[PDB]
Amino acid sequence: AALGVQSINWQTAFNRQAHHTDKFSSQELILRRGQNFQVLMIMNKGLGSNERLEFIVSTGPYPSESAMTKAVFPLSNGSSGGWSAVLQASNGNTLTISISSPASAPIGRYTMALQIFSQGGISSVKLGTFILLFNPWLNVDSVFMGNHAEREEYVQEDAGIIFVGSTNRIGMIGWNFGQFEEDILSICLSILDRSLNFRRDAATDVASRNDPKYVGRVLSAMINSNDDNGVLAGNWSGTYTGGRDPRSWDGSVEILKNWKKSGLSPVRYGQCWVFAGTLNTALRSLGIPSRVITNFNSAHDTDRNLSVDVYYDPMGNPLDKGSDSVWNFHVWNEGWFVRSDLGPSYGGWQVLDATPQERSQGVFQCGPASVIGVREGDVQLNFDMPFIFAEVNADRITWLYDNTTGKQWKNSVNSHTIGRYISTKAVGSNARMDVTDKYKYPEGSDQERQVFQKALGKLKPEPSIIGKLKVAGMLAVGKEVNLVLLLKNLSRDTKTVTVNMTAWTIIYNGTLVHEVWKDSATMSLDPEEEAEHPIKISYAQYERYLKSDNMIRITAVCKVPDESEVVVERDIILDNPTLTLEVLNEARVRKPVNVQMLFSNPLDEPVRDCVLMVEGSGLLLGNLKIDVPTLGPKERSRVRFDILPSRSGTKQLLADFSCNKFPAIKAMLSIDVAE
Ligand SMILES: [Br-]
Ligand SMILES: [Br-]
Ligand SMILES: [Br-]
Ligand SMILES: [Br-]
Ligand SMILES: [Ca+2]
Ligand SMILES: [Cl-]
Ligand SMILES: [Cl-]
Ligand SMILES: [Cl-]
Ligand SMILES: [Cl-]
Numbered sequence: 127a128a129l130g131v132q133s134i135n136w137q138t139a140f141n142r143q144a145h146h147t148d149k150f151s152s153q154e155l156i157l158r159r160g161q162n163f164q165v166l167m168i169m170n171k172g173l174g175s176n177e178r179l180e181f182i183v184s185t186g187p188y189p190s191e192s193a194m195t196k197a198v199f200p201l202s203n204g205s206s207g208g209w210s211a212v213l214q215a216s217n218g219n220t221l222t223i224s225i226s227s228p229a230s231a232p233i234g235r236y237t238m239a240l241q242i243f244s245q246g247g248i249s250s251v252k253l254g255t256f257i258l259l260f261n262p263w264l265n266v267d268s269v270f271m272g273n274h275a276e277r278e279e280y281v282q283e284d285a286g287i288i289f290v291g292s293t294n295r296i297g298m299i300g301w302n303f304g305q306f307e308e309d310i311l312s313i314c315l316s317i318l319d320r321s322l323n324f325r326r327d328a329a330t331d332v333a334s335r336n337d338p339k340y341v342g343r344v345l346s347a348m349i350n351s352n353d354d355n356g357v358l359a360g361n362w363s364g365t366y367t368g369g370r371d372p373r374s375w376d377g378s379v380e381i382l383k384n385w386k387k388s389g390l391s392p393v394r395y396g397q398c399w400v401f402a403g404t405l406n407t408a409l410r411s412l413g414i415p416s417r418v419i420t421n422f423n424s425a426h427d428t429d430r431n432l433s434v435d436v437y438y439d440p441m442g443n444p445l446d447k448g449s450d451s452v453w454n455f456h457v458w459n460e461g462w463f464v465r466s467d468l469g470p471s472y473g474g475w476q477v478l479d480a481t482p483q484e485r486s487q488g489v490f491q492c493g494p495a496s497v498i499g500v501r502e503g504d505v506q507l508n509f510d511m512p513f514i515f516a517e518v519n520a521d522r523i524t525w526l527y528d529n530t531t532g533k534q535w536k537n538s539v540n541s542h543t544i545g546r547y548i549s550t551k552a553v554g555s556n557a558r559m560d561v562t563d564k565y566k567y568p569e570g571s572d573q574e575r576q577v578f579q580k581a582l583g584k585l586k587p588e589p590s591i592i593g594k595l596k597v598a599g600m601l602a603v604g605k606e607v608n609l610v611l612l613l614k615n616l617s618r619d620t621k622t623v624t625v626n627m628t629a630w631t632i633i634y635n636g637t638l639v640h641e642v643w644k645d646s647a648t649m650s651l652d653p654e655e656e657a658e659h660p661i662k663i664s665y666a667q668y669e670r671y672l673k674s675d676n677m678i679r680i681t682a683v684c685k686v687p688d689e690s691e692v693v694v695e696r697d698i699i700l701d702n703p704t705l706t707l708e709v710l711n712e713a714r715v716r717k718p719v720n721v722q723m724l725f726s727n728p729l730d731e732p733v734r735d736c737v738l739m740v741e742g743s744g745l746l747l748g749n750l751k752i753d754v755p756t757l758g759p760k761e762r763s764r765v766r767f768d769i770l771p772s773r774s775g776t777k778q779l780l781a782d783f784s785c786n787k788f789p790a791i792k793a794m795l796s797i798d799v800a801e
Pocket of ligand 1: 352353354
């Protein structure tokens with residue numbers, strides 16, 4: 127009869143391997159754009175010079191030829207442009223065919239069909255479906271990344287490291303991107319079919335999915351619950367009843383899965399690193415090289431003038447009016463791709479921030495903004511440049527405010543404090559790569575103030591005493607907080623110095639929680655004399671209002687009879703008692719390896735409602751939740767559990783221990799898995 131497709135061999139393993147998509151847990155045919163893939167078609171007969179096969183690929187709810195969301199191409203003897211099929215061999219009934227997509231094809235789920243011309247007739251038949259992703263390996267693809275190690279880190283790595291803490295002590299927390307985990311790739315592709323853009327106009331949305339810029343920006347909006355459409359609900363209040371403490375999460379895996387499982391209902395709760403971590407997973411899964419960026423002393427300039435204000439009262443109390451405008455640290459992402467809309471000079475790292483902080487075009491989205499651009503004050507380019515620039519270059523201005531007198535007065539200005547130690551995990555290790563030199567020119571330099579002037583212009587057309595708060599003891603939850611305020615007159619005389627001090631528990635962003643300590647004193651020092659006022663806060667005094675942030679704002683407003691007040695400020699971090707993970711034998715694939723979780727309660731009282739949360743791609747399947755018996759005071763807890771490796775190489779086991787007295791204690795262990 128007429129020619130017909132009897133069966134088809136997609137050579138999934140072969141092609142996924144060549145397309146660098148053989149890591150995804152999915153059994154589907156995952157492919158990358160602008161690159162060939164081979165299929166074997168077993169026909170019911172031989173092919174004739176009179177016949178003809180035409181392939182039909184299409185994506186989205188309105189496959190359109192003129193939108194690239196649909197293409198029809200001839201099985202040829204030579205390759206053409208865009209989509210194409212090439213007959214490489216015809217052994218009797220079976221046909222070896224090479225198909226290729228254009229480097230600019232929309233990414234997403236496609237369907238394949240065949241229209242056979244044979245013996246004066248015509249027939250069609252669906253062949254199958256496949257996923258087409260961005261090709262960071264393809265030189266002509268906007269997301270191209272030439273270096274092997276780099277591309278392996280920013281695309282193939284599913285174990286991450288995010289820097290947190292303060293400009294006083296940079297710490298890190300492990301993060302499970304797990305883009306290769308079950309259902310993850312799929313869910314992330316689902317995100318694009320749930321965006322405001324897609325509801326507004328599905329056809330145009332799908333057609334724009336061939337652009338990393340569009341896909342980037344959309345994701346920065348959909349990773350957050352905001353706009354009544356998104357994944358993670360932010361919360362910086364210190365009260366997380368109804369959801370989960372932002373600091374307890376360990377990956378993007380259970381977050382994205384819960385999203386789906388819950389019927390697309392907001393996952394609770396998240397804070398900036400949670401957004402960046404989850405966004406990174408979505409970016410990397412789709413094929414956009416991405417990395418997590420952490421900026422210390424990050425400013426949120428509510429009004430474009432590259433200047434944020436923070437206030438205090440004469441009593442040393444931090445005021446709310448601007449106490450969260452300068453986060454101890456804020457995290458975001460960077461996508462790697464060219465900017466055809468900006469020029470050759472602005473390609474490279476692009477800023478993407480899914481944290482609902484500033485409204486953009488009426489929506490809670492942010493980016494992509496050229497990092498090279500941000501470094502040049504070319505703030506008029508898209509997107510959200512003014513916001514991100516101030517986020518790293520804004521001037522910090524302190525103010526004293528008297529509630530009674532109503533008066534308000536400027537205390538000191540600082541343009542070096544904001545934007546410090548901008549960090550990101552290093553390629554191949556847990557080292558800290560500092561990329562400050564990428565966002566701005568060295569502070570205290572011509573280029574600094576030049577770019578800053580250029581920016582502000584494009585956007586907006588004698589003390590006597592020295593203060594210094596210092597830690598004096600191992601700061602830790604459960605231990606008393608010992609500090610010492612250092613003062614010293616510099617002038618030649620004996621001054622009388624009044625000091626108003628307070629201590630508040632806060633969230634890392636600056637949200638004021640509650641006062642846990644305060645005190646006043648007066649002291650007169652002789653010329654060049656150095657004083658030491660000890661500050662002591664007991665556990666009982668702060669444990670009540672200390673949040674998972676384990677942070678306390680310490681302030682000291684000092685004043686001399688006829689001078690200006692010297693504001694001495696310092697945020698501290700208390701460490702959690704240690705949580706340990708131990709492998710008990712050599713780790714090998716498909717071979718069970720016993721692990722131990724060890725914890726010791728330092729308190730005088732026991733800790734209750736203990737739960738152990740463990741996970742790690744390649745080591746475990748999903749998350750492992752374990753109820754831990756109440757642990758008495760000064761006692762130790764040993765919990766054993768077996769894990770079964772699935773992939774070899776260096777894997778990351780992450781753990782979380784939570785109990786009423788100690789929310790979110792993290793643990794991390796690199797495990798080498800033998801083949
Ligand atoms: Br909203
Ligand atoms: Br909030
Ligand atoms: Br500290
Ligand atoms: Br498992
Ligand atoms: Ca949103
Ligand atoms: Cl290649
Ligand atoms: Cl999947
Ligand atoms: Cl870099
Ligand atoms: Cl690690």
